[PDB]
Amino acid sequence: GKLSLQDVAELIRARACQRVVVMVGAGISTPSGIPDFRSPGSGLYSNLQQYDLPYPEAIFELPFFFHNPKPFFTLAKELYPGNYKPNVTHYFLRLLHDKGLLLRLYTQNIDGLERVSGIPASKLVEAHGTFASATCTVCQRPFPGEDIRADVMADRVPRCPVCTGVVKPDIVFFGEPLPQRFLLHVVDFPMADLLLILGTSLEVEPFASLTEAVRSSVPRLLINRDLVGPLAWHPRSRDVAQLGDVVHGVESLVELLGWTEEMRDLVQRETGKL
Amino acid sequence: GKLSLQDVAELIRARACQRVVVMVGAGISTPSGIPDFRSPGSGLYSNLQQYDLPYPEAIFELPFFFHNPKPFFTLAKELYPGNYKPNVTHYFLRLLHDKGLLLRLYTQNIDGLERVSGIPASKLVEAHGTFASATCTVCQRPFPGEDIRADVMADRVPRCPVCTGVVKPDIVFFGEPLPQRFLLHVVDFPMADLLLILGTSLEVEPFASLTEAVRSSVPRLLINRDLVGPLAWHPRSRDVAQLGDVVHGVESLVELLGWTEEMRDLVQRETGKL
């Protein structure tokens, strides 16, 4: 301490760290061109203007949703599977999995790009939910995401074929508990020997607090624009902050690991398949 | 097998059963005069007529609530603490606790009568929530139940003093996970050496499924009008069904246990304190 990025890379290369837990947020997906709905200059922002939302978070609040589900469904249509592709940061995580290093990847993102990059569902915790499935808000019948796709793409609010209630994608709204898969953290975090935090400001609970659940000996590597949350006001001696652009931090780590050419080959072959 | 009610009583009197888990539903509270909101002949039913609910369960459904919280708040006003008192069945459970037999009492009821009868919160799992606390539906600020009492009693929808959102009592609505305290069942049920099920038709999940979580050797005593749910289609050899009026079944068990005079003294002294 302080450890450097190169030290963390050597810990991995020497097989001193064998079980990596990863936490990711919106910063890993901006490079795929996913618009920040809350910032001017995207089709999504402009499409949301007509609704004059009181504030951006209302898009994931139940009282607002029931009053008018159209803004949320504007976002759903943009983020529904097939529109965006994973980028280098996702394929780095996929390569990490393929090399036997991934214990679990916890994501706050709802773009589904981790599964699209080919990481097994069993290795993933989609902590803020998924568009792969949906639930009637009235009768609780579950539906595959594909079942409401036609309505979503046509700007029709999806209705339940049994009771006519609004059918909502399984995205976690504020105030709702995270999906039960989130409870894997109880066993996963004490088992981790390295924590990687990529592209997140750690502003949402209870996801953010996971950073404290690894053992005091376990290095915590942050690759992010700045120092954030519990990492910023709860510094440990084995914390490494690689502050900067997320993709550049990943590219640096990948080169230190010795994986550059392999990563490039993987990315070329994968994107073609999409 | 089949065991009788008298056999279960002897198991308790001989201290062969020392750790009782209890599950209760609406049948234990009808004797306190709590109206079934979904049946003609009560002030509550009549007060709910003006809203012409499509069906009774809508009172605990979020889409309906947000569309019109007034029916739910009509129910809240009726059930808010201080209106109803516990009856003999609650005081039987209180006496069970006082005699060192209660591992945990799981209730589907939201009338709060278990805590009013003097059973410690630590022994209780209020699985369908409580009017003792409330949460802003928009900003998630918690409030003591007492903070919204004035509005509830005056038929005003309680609004949040910080963001003006509707403040909703912590009652579990359909589709919502049960409170995290419900997870005590994971440890409690395997630890139980007797399961008592009182006054419930076991029609709501995931509460109903708890009946299967005790060990195959553990007797399951049902005191209820009829045979219900997993007990009815998943009979075990140590199941006892005391079918009949709930209070009469309790009074019979109490007499077999040898607790009648003590129970009567307890009830007299407790109700006075209210």
Binding site: E57, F174, P177, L178, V204, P206, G229 | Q180
Partner: peptide
């Protein structure tokens, strides 16, 4: 609390 909330 169980709920998703901004910190």
């Amino acid at each position: 609390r169980s709920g998703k909330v901004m910190r």
